[PDB]
Design a binder for this molecule. Structure first.
Ligand code: GET
Ligand code: GET
Ligand code: GET
Ligand code: YMZ
Ligand code: ZN
Ligand code: ZN
Lengths: 249, 86, 112, 50
RNA sequence: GCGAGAGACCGAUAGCGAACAAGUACAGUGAUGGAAAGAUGAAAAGAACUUUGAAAAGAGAGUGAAAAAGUACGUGAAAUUG
RNA sequence: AAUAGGGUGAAGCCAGAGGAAACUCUGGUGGAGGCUCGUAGCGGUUCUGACGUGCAAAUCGAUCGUCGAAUUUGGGUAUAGG
RNA sequence: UGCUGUAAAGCUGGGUCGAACGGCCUCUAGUGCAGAUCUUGGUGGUAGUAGCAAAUAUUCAAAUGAGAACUUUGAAGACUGAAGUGGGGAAAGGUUCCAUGUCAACAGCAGUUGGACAUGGGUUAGUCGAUCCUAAGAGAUGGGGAAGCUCCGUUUCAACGUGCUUGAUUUUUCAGGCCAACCAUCGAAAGGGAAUCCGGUUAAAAUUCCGGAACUUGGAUAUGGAUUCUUCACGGCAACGUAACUGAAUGUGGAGACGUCGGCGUGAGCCCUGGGAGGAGUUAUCUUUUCUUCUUAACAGCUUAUCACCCUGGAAUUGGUUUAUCCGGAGAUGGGGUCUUAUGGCUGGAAGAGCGCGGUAAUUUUGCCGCGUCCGGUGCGCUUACGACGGUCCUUGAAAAUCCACAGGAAGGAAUAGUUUUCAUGCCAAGUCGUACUCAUAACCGCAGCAGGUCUCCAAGGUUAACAGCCUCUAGUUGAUAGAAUAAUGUAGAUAAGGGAAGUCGGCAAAAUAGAUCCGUAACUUCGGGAUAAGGAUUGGCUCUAAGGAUCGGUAACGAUCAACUUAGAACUGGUACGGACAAGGGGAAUCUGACUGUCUAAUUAAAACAUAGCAUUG
RNA sequence: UAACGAGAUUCCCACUGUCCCUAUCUACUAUCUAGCGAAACCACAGCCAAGGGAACGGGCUUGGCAGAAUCAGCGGGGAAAG
RNA sequence: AAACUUUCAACAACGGAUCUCUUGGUUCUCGCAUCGAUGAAGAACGCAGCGAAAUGCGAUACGUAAUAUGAAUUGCAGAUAUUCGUGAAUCAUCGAAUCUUUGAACGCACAUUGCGCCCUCUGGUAUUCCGGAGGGCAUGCCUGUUUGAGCGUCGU
């Protein structure tokens, strides 16, 4: 047979991300002295669109603590953040929408976004439009905080990890139907080469494990072992179950 | 349309002249000569292509220096000048 | 009607290959090549165009004297009049308010 | 094309120089074998391959 | 590679691809592919001159041992043709 | 970098009319859309037309699909034989 | 010419020819051809045969020449018809360009002609490009893999400056200080980017030469001006103005720098048009006539603007206002100012140029002279540039070089002295490579001078919705073997009594319909459609009538002057014609099937196949 | 299942040379000429009937018969060519 | 009976077999050890009185010097070229030189005849701007020199 499309994606030739029009990576500030011990004030300069991203970005300017120079940061904008607003980041920062605080400083029930998995990684969790992370509980003796993620998973993070108070802006994109192949075309035009998708059962046996036959059909179970090898993992990879979901989960 | 019509769209050179060997085998985008392997330090050659070795090898050029080594060896690699006779 | 040709080797209608049709004293109709339009100098705070500043292609700003490139005021060729006024009042009122916070703090410190 | 490199134009100059008929005084030399220039080239038939 | 001497070898469709301005001419985007083609006569003595023709050429003449050797040149088979 | 000329007439806006109210009706304006008739362009349905030792190793004539976008296209650049 | 042998073969007469060769005894082998769709070369029949038929079309005379259907000149008839058979370029070619000679081969007839052949000539730049910048990307370097060719990394686990500024000192040595986040390099003749125009000139070059007139960058440097004893200028309430009018490190901002569509406004070029002054044409008759010339560059100065802004003032009887509905106590309307100079006006450039006429010098190189070159109008016109607006996206539509400005306040500065070349004038210099020509029914690729293929700019009159079709002007071609005839069968195109799909697998092919105005329009429906459903009527020419505007001037409801093509109606009129050529839907009732727009088997399949939005599942 | 379709199908109206049943006209060929000038194919070749025969002969056997050189057409045969 | 066709013969064609040769090939043997950063092999472009190749050569360009030798070269032309001679011709010999642009290819780059920097001299009134001549600036590694870094570390 032939190398399937699955496998071709990893060589990264025509499947690399289209990044010319992107507006810089969205990260928190580096943990510095000011954020460890106090707070630093910055001002929102711009709220801009990032192609390929559903959420708008905020350009926020900060003074450099150690030399006469202005530092610009690219943040993920939460809803309600406006141009000209002052942003406070640090341990002593107040509990206001857009402020960056350690998770230990936020009370139970706080909604927060762009949350760090590890202390100082500048943000990993709850970054897409409309999503957020909920603070569930604190374990001060272990210096651990328990959070709830957009997928529903519960996780334990260091209380020194940071997050940005509020909900990521741009929420509700998916409530409106795309309606058109052309809208999908323009969507992925600035993301990557993943669209349109040819169905495996519409190919020949060289192309796919689903190819061939005198009718279009899969022919064996579409649930594939986690221990299968590349070229075999097409279908439902290591599925615990299949079929329509009914009842609670 | 893959024959005569398609043959009408040939006006972008894949190869240009190679500085080292001069053949028009210097691939423009790869910046490599398909004939001599320029700009690699070694000359391209293969034992499965003996006739390619014949075309470009020692003795196909001028041999401006090796030409005269055997005469210089024959005289013991002399230094100095010749002497007029009595 | 007389028809014209590009005076340069570029045969394509690009941003840098625009032409104007002019009539010469020889009675001819010729194409004349047009430089790209200049953009206004803009305020560094609000983005509006600045009054009193010449509109030139950026290399040409090194040829004119300083009076065509600035305005006689603080931040003259950089920020517009309203944003300069707004910077002055904000600087005054905040630094006055800082003294009100300093003096009041001492009273809060003194009263207890 | 009109726009051309120095290297190309130098090759074109040499190509013109070699496209000439035999000097007829050559044929008069003692034991001459060349009757004509066998390495002529016409621009429309055989291409230079530069 | 450099210098030599040889052969119950081949003799121009043979012998190296190449006896010759042969790795040439030429082909291919490229890697590569790659021919054909030796011999007038001892000597050019390579036909002065006249004539017909627009000319190429012809007819005389001339050189040569030979033009039944005329740079379509040693001999000059067969197919095929007058 | 390129893409005649028409048809239809979406939101928004103006005016008038009706109604107790909730609301509704009429005339304009406006100029939306992988909308439509149809050039250039791009494509290639049918004649199973021509041609079929061709003009051509895929062409020619008519007929035809589409024609403001998932549109057409130059140049640059990347992906290389299981 | 014969002889010998059953034969494989051997010998001999005659001719041709020119340098070596044979018998016998033995040795040895790359040793014997009719075939292998054998190999290479050569040659027939076919056969003077197939054929040399797309792209409207040629003709008379003269010249030249041995020779003319094919060359040149004149006359004419035509065509392309500005979406060109016109004028240029990019890619590619490479001398094909030009002049002179020239016809063996080539131009599938011919050839005196040629992109052929031969000999020469020809490509001139500070301002046009390349060169430089970065784009996707490519790729060296401390390094980490790999037996290795080499692979990987480029914000790369690295002691990574061939740093810079002054105070000067000459001693070519110093003294300091300031920083080093980033930065090898390559990557665009369409992206970014310092600066040139007009007239003339060659056989062949020109934004490159000549003449005139400028501009840019780099440098030097003098005069004039400006500034300072209130040291680093004044004026304006302000927006801001100006000939100038210190400003280190460092920091910040602007430009470079950006999709697409819609109508509206303005400019320019073109189109149209009145008067006048020249020239041509027509003149049976007429036409204040039909045609043609009347032009103005870069650059310099002054002036010129929508938008934006400032001052005043304080708004409901809400007003201002666009084709498009936004704006105003966060200050409208009103009044007065400021600014960008896109674009236009006047002047210089510049009439000296160019153009149109008229007269001459004369076999003459080349001129020489005079006169005119002027004043208006018009617009849903065409193209293009700019402007102010409006819409649109789960799409929001490059980077870098490079230049300027600000913030900052280091340092240095006047009293009879330093600036400052961001004010004026003057001085010097600008290297390298490309530059001819074709760009295509003959200069490129398709084996070729092949009906194929191959990116782009300019774009006149009439008809019209129209850049379609049809006719025409400028320009360009008149090329494609030709002559004589006009059987059959073809190919391409037409018409046909009566019938009207009986033909055929099948209405295949053809026909029929068709523009515009007015009327009228069903089921069904996702309420958007269906729909040009279906189905009717009208349409020429001429002579009239009515409506729809602009600018000035105080019940102005008015006068005066000007002006564009749309719409509606009536009379008359003809072989009842009239979207008169051109251009230009056939329609209806249903079934199967895919929702739709979209996509693929280059060269036998375009579909019901693929995609798609929507839906679900999985990690 | 509205809308859409160069998709497959049935009927109707209109329309017609598809047909009854053919005729006529034009251009370019074909044709004849001057010039120019290929290719496929080719064991040898080329009139029939029957026989026998590798069971369908141009040739063989027995008969019919049989007169140069040819031109335009033609598609029975050459179990024609590819 | 001609024409036509067929067969033979002669002569003439077409074509290049045959025969004769051979500065070539092919095999065997004998002898020798010598490429390159002191820039090779290879590439490009040039160079002659009249040359396109081949052959030779490098702006000193079908060659310069030197040694030997002793009258040519030659297709034509021509010495301010030569003959009992420092003398014609000569890749005869060869020990001195020249050796464009490149190439392992070395300042950087190279689809560019693109772009720096250092030293000496020199032109334009010039340490800086513009021009000319000559000489320099690659990488890995070795030995050494010099200037340095590290509370790695000794002593005072
Ligand atoms: C001028 N034309 C030349 C011509 O020189 C030709 O030469 C042949 C020549 O080779 C022949 O001569 C021949 O002689 C013998 C024998 C067969 O004759 C051959 O073996 C040999 O190869 C050859 N030299 C000679 N007989 C005729 C020329 N035209 O060589 C080629 C050519 C282009 O046709
Ligand atoms: C299923 N096994 C196949 C096996 O059949 C074989 O595949 C060959 C393939 O290698 C050949 O291909 C080979 O040769 C071609 C060419 C020179 O012909 C090259 O292009 C190719 O690189 C070379 N691998 C291909 N021509 C036929 C397959 N069956 O080679 C191994 C294999 C790929 O696993
Ligand atoms: C135990 N030895 C480790 C040695 O493995 C190494 O650690 C590297 C560390 O330097 C790298 O990290 C480093 O390099 C990455 C680079 C690769 O992108 C940088 O982004 C990062 O800033 C830099 N600190 C880390 N990403 C992996 C560790 N094994 O260097 C540190 C060390 C302690 O010597
Ligand atoms: O835990 C709750 C909570 C909710 C939310 C909300 F859902 F709105 F985002 N935000 C909370 C926040 C907040 F993130 F800062 F807004 C802090 C503390 C508790 C919050 C309750 C809300 C009522 C007051 C007590 N905490
Ligand atoms: Zn090479
Ligand atoms: Zn502002």
């Amino acid at each position: 047979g032939r190398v399937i499309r699955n496998q071709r994606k990893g060589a990264g030739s025509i499947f690399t991300s289209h990044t010319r029009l992107r507006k810089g990576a969205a990260k928190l500030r580096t943990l510095d002295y000011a954020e460890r011990h106090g707070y630093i004030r910055g001002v929102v300069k711009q709220i801009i669109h990032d192609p390929g991203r559903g959420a708008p970005l905020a350009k926020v300017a900060f003074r450099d603590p150690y030399k006469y120079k202005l530092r610009e940061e690219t943040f993920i904008a939460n809803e309600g953040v406006y141009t000209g607003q002052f942003i406070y980041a640090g341990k002593k920062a107040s509990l206001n929408v857009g402020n960056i605080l350690p998770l230990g400083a936020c009370p139970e029930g706080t909604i927060v976004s762009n949350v760090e998995e590890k202390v100082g990684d500048r943000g990993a969790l709850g970054r897409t439009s409309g999503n957020y992370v909920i603070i569930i509980g604190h374990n001060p003796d272990e210096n651990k905080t328990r959070v709830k993620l957009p997928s529903g998973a519960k996780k334990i993070i260091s209380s020194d990890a940071r997050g940005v108070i509020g909900v990521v802006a741009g929420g509700g994109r998916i409530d409106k139907p795309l309606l058109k192949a052309g809208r999908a075309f323009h969507k992925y035009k600035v993301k990557r080469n993943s669209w349109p998708k040819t169905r495996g059962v519409a190919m020949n046996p060289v192309d796919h494990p689903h190819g061939g036959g005198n009718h279009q059909h899969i022919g064996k179970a579409s649930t594939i072992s986690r221990g299968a090898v590349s070229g075999q993992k097409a279908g439902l990879i290591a599925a615990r179950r299949t079929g329509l979901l009914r009842g609670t989960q | 349309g893959k024959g005569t019509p398609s043959l009408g769209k040939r006006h972008n050179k894949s190869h240009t002249l190679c500085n080292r060997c001069g053949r028009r085998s210097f691939h423009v985008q790869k910046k490599t000569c398909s004939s001599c392997g320029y700009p690699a330090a070694k000359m391209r050659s293969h034992n499965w292509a003996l006739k390619a070795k014949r075309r470009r090898t020692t003795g196909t050029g001028r041999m401006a220096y090796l030409k005269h080594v055997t005469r210089r060896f024959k005289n013991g690699f002399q230094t100095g000048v010749a002497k007029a006779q009595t | 009607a007389q028809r014209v040709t590009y005076r340069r080797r570029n045969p394509y209608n690009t941003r840098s290959n625009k032409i104007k049709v002019v009539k010469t004293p020889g009675g001819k109709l010729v194409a004349q090549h047009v430089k790209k339009a200049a953009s206004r100098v803009k305020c560094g705070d609000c983005g509006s165009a600045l009054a009193g500043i010449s509109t030139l292609r950026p290399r040409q700003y090194a040829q004119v004297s300083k009076t065509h490139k600035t305005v006689q005021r603080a931040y003259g060729g950089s920020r517009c009049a309203n944003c300069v006024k707004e910077r002055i009042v904000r600087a005054f009122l905040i630094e006055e308010q800082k003294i009100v916070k300093r003096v009041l703090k001492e009273q809060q410190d003194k009263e207890k | 094309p009109s726009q051309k490199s120095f290297r190309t134009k130098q090759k074109l100059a040499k190509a013109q120089k070699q496209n000439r008929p035999l000097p007829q005084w050559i044929r008069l030399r003692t034991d001459n074998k060349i009757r004509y220039n066998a390495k002529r080239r016409h621009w429309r038939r055989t291409k230079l391959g530069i």
